[PDB]
């Protein structure tokens, strides 16, 4: 308390100094999206505003007399108008092709720069930019499942030389199926963490759109943008949202969504080659998927995430109780035996509730009794709500 008077004196000076520093440097606005002045190149910005003219986005439609020395380009300037224009002298004639977006000036509308194909902002947000914090070490009891998963979705991209030499075309599709909580999305999160190519996460419910043909459009632009990369990974979580089997119920039942599935089937294996895309779909209702989608060449590998065996359950217990403050002789093999048919999700909850009982008793170490009570609360007491019995019939 002896320094209380002086601490506030220097604390206020620092705040006064901080505010005074902001007076000279400038830390304000931030509501019109203004960057801090340390990045302000005003001299350059003035030059850009004159030297660099703005360009209107237009799409080339037809090239007239491309063979001759006077090639004329018909452009569609969005909602403005259509113009027959000539190419600018600072770009090559071979760089502009029909059906490609171009940048045109406002005076003579001559094409100044080719532009990337238009992609829906929602589709652009589908590619994973921050990888998950989950590795393959966090998946237990899926040893055979992971190796099959890796050798199709990881090995070809990491070491492509081992397949070209032997004339091997590795599978370009994996379907992960199993009851809920079995690790289907967990393995895909491990794949995205480890992968070096572009990863696109697509939830099937995201492909359901209000208007007619819009869902199939997003599938087209999804594969269009995946093809703009040397190697790509598309993850279709809960593909049963759009991958349902086709049917005719008199009325137009699920006709629109079936078209989205038909588009996805077309991009996977159609007239055109798919590309270097290796797709990956996870669903807990694989019996509902269309036979065309469940066919090799679209989903070549069918990896089943069945409920873990005794060795697998003990491994998942070790994974989730790794960072716990457990006791000496926690018989994890015994705990794995007390939940015969239990998903890894239940095992994680058992670990959480086991330490939750210890927190309840103001104890810093989780005993074996706490795990025994956790098994009763999760495996036994919560067996009324268990999704396992209903979903093994589906898988």
């Amino acid at each position: 308390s002896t320094y209380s008077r002086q601490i506030k004196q220097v604390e206020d000076d620092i705040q006064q100094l901080l505010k005074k520093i902001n007076e000279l440097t400038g830390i304000k606005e931030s509501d019109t999206g203004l960057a801090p002045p340390a990045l302000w190149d005003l001299a350059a910005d003035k030059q850009t505003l004159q030297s660099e003219q703005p360009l209107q986005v237009a799409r080339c439609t037809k090239i007239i007399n491309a063979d001759s020395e006077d090639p004329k380009y018909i452009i569609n300037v969005k909602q403005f108008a259509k113009f027959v224009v000539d190419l600018s002298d600072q770009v090559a004639p071979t760089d502009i092709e029909e059906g490609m977006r171009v940048g045109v000036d406002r005076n003579k509308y001559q094409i100044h720069i080719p532009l990337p194909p238009k992609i829906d902002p929602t589709v652009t947000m589908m590619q994973v930019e921050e990888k998950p914090d989950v590795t393959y070490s966090d998946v237990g009891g899926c040893k055979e499942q992971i190796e099959k998963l890796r050798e199709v979705v990881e090995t070809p991209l990491l070491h492509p030389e081992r397949f070209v030499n032997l004339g091997i075309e590795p599978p370009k599709g994996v379907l992960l199926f199993g009851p809920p909580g079995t690790g289907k999305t967990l393995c895909a999160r491990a794949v995205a963490n480890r992968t070096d190519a572009c990863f696109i996460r697509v939830i099937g419910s995201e492909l359901v759109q209000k208007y007619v043909g819009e869902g199939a459009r997003m599938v087209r632009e999804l594969f269009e943008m995946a093809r703009t990369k040397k190697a790509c990974l598309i993850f279709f979580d809960e593909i049963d949202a759009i991958g349902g089997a086709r049917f005719d119920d008199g009325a137009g039942g699920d006709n629109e969504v079936q078209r989205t599935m038909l588009e996805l089937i077309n991009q996977l294996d159609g007239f055109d080659p798919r590309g270097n895309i290796k797709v990956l779909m996870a669903t807990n209702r694989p019996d509902t998927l269309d036979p065309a989608l469940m066919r090799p060449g679209r989903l070549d590998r069918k990896i089943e995430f069945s409920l873990p065996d005794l060795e697998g359950r003990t491994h998942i217990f070790k994974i989730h109780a790794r960072s716990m403050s457990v006791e000496r002789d926690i018989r994890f093999e015994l705990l794995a035996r007390l939940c015969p048919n239990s998903t890894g999700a239940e095992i994680r909850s058992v670990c959480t509730e086991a330490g939750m009982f210890a927190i309840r008793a103001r104890r810093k170490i989780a005993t074996e009794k706490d795990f025994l009570e956790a098994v009763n609360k999760v495996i036994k007491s919560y067996a009324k709500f268990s999704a396992t019995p209903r979903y093994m019939t589906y898988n």
Partner: protein
């Protein structure tokens, strides 16, 4: 008006009336009750006697009672009430006075809040008291012999240090330190050593050293000794201990710091004690580690480049660094061991110099086996390959000190070799091979090289660099004379060469962290010409205060950066910016406070001033891939100024050196695409990619170890060599002198946690690894890690990640769980 409050208001008159009577019979019962009346409200911290606050003007009636007659019992309790009234007002020379002159009973009887104000007073008046007032501290001392025991009783220990630090009497703390608070008292004042200046800098450590020595806490006593660079005290700490199990742990800590101790053969277990501290077993321990991490597979630069996902002499020379950096100190490579001739000869000119030397970096710390591999290139007819293989031996022996010396033998015969390139691979080889040795054998063999007529300025610089590494922080008299001699013997035009910038570093390296021992040296730098003198004056002054955080010195550094010149005259401005990082790298508070100042140099600065601030970011946060610096560097990778673009990208690699950061590698891969058509920028991008995957993530270049509290002389020498060479990135790094990038070999250490048994064998146990948490202040048992996870022991610790044993099966010899740790069975465990 409460009746009980009015009852005390009655004592303002009726009790004073009892003290107003001539007879002393009524004096004692009223005063004794009045003395106890204070304790009535003292029992509650918030409750204070407000009627007593109205008795302050009543002291006039009591003025003659406590002043004008005998002090037996009349003044005794009369003054103490005024002292109780004295914490309410300013209390300048009053609260202590009635305490000092009044009753001399136990201090805590008047309240914890009273002594806290009383303790605050004794420090305030201590500064006021002059030398002639030494007779006035007789009762002043008695209180602090009772205030300190009172403070430790009620867990208010940190206030106890605050008392005797102010009065500069920290010595008497150790006599009253108990077993229940020795760690808390040490942990507090040791955290104050990062800000308190000399002479209280060493003095505060000495008292902490005494406490640890008193309580037989040898491993943490040795840590304090190294921080004070007390060569004498290191021997006394080492040999005082009798538990031999405890002693081998120090040699691990001592060897990691790179300080050698010449033990006597009479000391028990002499052999393994030297072997442990000489890091001869480091290669086996390192190789056994990564075998457990199953990363023995060699890595090609293509696996680092990942060009298959991408939608020349420089390229080949760039990939040579990327090759060696990734599998450094691993001993196996798919690109150099396997028919190295095609790859090595695929490089050209000085590219073969670094390509050949890259073979010694993959055998780092492999003194025996590494020497077995460079010999094939040691007989090469090409001038560069042999000299590159010459420097490869120095890289191989860098960081390892064996008893009988190979590296001097293979390279002594070539320090005067007629071809400068053959010479060039020699001195830089010896500098790395014996960095931080202060061995007169190598120095005397290396010293005349700088004075040779055949030695060019390129050779002249490396000799100062190398001799600086051997005698780093030693203030060697011999090297100072010759480095100064060379500096003024060079011409005005000769000093214009940027290789001349290295001679001051050799002088600066010798005084690394020494402090104010440079005024004699700085006086010598007065006689040399400009603008080299200004650069030399700035550089050596900076290395003097490295890891000190002396703001006054940083104040001078910012003034040098303040005045701008419309290049040639502003070459010294880059060193000042690197100086701020080199000074503030001590404590976290200064380092982060330096980041904002770096941004302002990055905004208001001129090109030559702005070209070095990326280097400052690398030095201040090497192997610490924090997002604030990376984003700051990321924005400035594609800058208009080529050096700033070159330096920033290299800084990103050094900031993430050995971290294997997935986010950083993605940025570097993206920077490769952006700078594909700029070979110079791409070479820096390629250089950064090699550094971020240094040693497959098993190595660090951070100069700090022991919970970021111990400064390694060799590591800073290795870093300073690289970043000071980066001030002229056009001519040195991108030019013909990229071998200077092998200076960071001196800074290579493994981010290690290997717990050994008492017989030094591996002992994998469960540990908790997570971000460190400051444990200063809050009493009880606060957690020192947050967001932690449980791994087995042979795990790589990132910067700022502490480690605690999850269980209690083993008692660590040292609290600091870094590097190699010896574990002992806990007797209480399994009782």
């Amino acid at each position: 008006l409460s009746e009980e409050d009015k009852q005390l208001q009655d004592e303002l008159e009726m009790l004073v009336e009892r003290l107003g009577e001539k007879d002393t019979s009524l004096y004692r019962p009223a005063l004794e009750e009045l003395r106890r009346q204070i304790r009535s409200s003292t029992t509650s911290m918030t409750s204070v006697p407000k009627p007593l606050k109205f008795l302050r003007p009543h002291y006039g009636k009591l003025k003659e009672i406590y002043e004008n007659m005998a002090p037996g019992e009349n003044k005794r309790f009369a003054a103490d009430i005024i002292s109780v009234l004295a914490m309410t007002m300013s209390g300048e020379r009053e609260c202590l006075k009635y305490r000092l002159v009044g009753s001399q009973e136990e201090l805590a009887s008047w309240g914890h809040e009273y002594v806290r104000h009383l303790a605050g007073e004794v420090a305030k008046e201590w500064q006021e008291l002059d030398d002639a007032e030494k007779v006035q501290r007789e009762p002043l001392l008695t209180l602090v012999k009772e205030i300190v025991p009172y403070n430790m009783a009620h867990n208010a220990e940190h206030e106890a240090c605050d008392l005797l630090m102010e009065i500069e009497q920290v010595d008497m703390l150790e006599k009253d330190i108990d077993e229940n608070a020795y760690a808390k008292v040490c942990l507090y004042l040791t955290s104050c050593v990062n800000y308190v200046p000399e002479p209280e800098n060493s003095a505060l450590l000495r008292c902490a050293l005494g406490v640890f020595r008193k309580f037989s806490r040898f491993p943490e006593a040795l840590r304090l000794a190294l921080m004070l660079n007390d060569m004498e005290l290191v021997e006394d700490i080492f040999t005082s201990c009798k538990d031999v199990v405890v002693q081998k742990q120090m040699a691990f800590m001592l060897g990691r710091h790179g300080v050698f101790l010449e033990l006597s053969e009479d000391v028990e277990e002499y052999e393994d004690l030297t072997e442990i501290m000489s890091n001869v077993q480091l290669n086996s321990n390192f190789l056994a580690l990564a075998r457990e991490l199953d990363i023995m597979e060699p890595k090609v630069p293509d696996d680092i480049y990942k060009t298959h996902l991408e939608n020349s002499a420089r390229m080949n020379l760039a990939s040579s660094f990327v090759n060696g950096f990734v599998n450094a100190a691993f001993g196996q490579d798919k690109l150099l061991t396997d028919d190295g001739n095609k790859w090595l000869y695929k490089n050209k000119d000085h590219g073969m110099l670094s390509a050949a030397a890259s073979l010694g970096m993959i055998l780092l710390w492999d003194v025996d086996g590494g020497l077995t591999q460079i010999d094939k290139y040691l007989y090469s007819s090409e001038d560069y390959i042999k000299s590159g293989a010459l420097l490869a031996c120095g890289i191989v022996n860098s960081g390892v000190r064996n008893e009988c010396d190979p590296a001097l033998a293979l390279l002594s015969d070539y320090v005067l070799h007629n071809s400068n390139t053959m010479r060039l691979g020699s001195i830089f080889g010896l500098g790395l091979a014996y960095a931080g040795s202060n061995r007169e054998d190598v120095l005397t063999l290396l010293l005349p090289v700088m004075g040779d007529s055949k030695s060019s300025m390129e050779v002249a610089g490396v000799t100062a660099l190398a001799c600086g590494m051997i005698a780093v922080g030693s203030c060697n008299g011999d090297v100072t004379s010759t480095i100064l001699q060379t500096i003024m013997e060079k011409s005005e035009t000769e000093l214009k060469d940027t290789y001349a910038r290295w001679l001051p570093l050799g002088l600066g390296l010798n005084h690394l962290g020494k402090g104010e021992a440079i005024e004699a040296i700085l006086a010598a730098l007065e006689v040399v010409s400009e603008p080299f003198r200004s650069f030399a004056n700035t550089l050596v002054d900076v290395c003097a205060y490295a890891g000190s955080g002396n703001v006054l010195k940083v104040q001078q550094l910012l003034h040098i950066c303040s005045e701008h010149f419309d290049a040639d005259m502003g070459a010294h401005q880059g060193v000042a910016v690197l100086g701020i990082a080199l000074i503030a790298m001590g404590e976290e508070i200064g380092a982060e406070m330096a980041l904002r100042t770096f941004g302002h140099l990055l905004r208001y600065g001129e090109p030559t001033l702005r070209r070095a601030v990326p280097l400052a970011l690398a030095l201040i946060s090497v192997s610490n891939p924090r997002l604030n610096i990376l984003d700051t560097l990321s924005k400035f990778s594609h800058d208009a100024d080529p050096e700033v673009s070159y330096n920033s990208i290299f800084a990103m690699g050094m900031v993430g050196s050995g971290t294997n950061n997935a986010r950083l590698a993605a940025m570097l891969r993206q920077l490769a695409q952006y700078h594909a058509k700029d070979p110079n920028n791409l070479f820096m991008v390629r250089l950064a990619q090699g550094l971020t995957h240094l040693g497959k993530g098993t190595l660090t270049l951070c100069p700090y170890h022991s919970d970021r509290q111990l400064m390694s002389q060799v590591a800073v020498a290795g870093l300073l060599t690289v970043l000071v060479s980066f001030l002229d990135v056009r001519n040195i790094i991108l030019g013909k002198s990229h071998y200077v990038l092998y200076g960071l070999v001196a800074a290579m250490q493994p981010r290690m946690l290997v717990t050994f048994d008492e017989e030094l064998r591996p002992l994998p146990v469960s540990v908790r690894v997570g971000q460190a948490v400051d444990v200063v202040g809050q009493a009880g048992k606060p957690k020192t890690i947050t967001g932690f996870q449980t791994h087995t022991t042979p795990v790589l610790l990132a910067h700022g990640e502490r480690a605690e044993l999850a269980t209690e099966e083993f008692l660590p010899v040292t609290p600091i769980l870094e590097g190699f740790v010896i574990l002992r069975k806990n007797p209480n465990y399994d009782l």
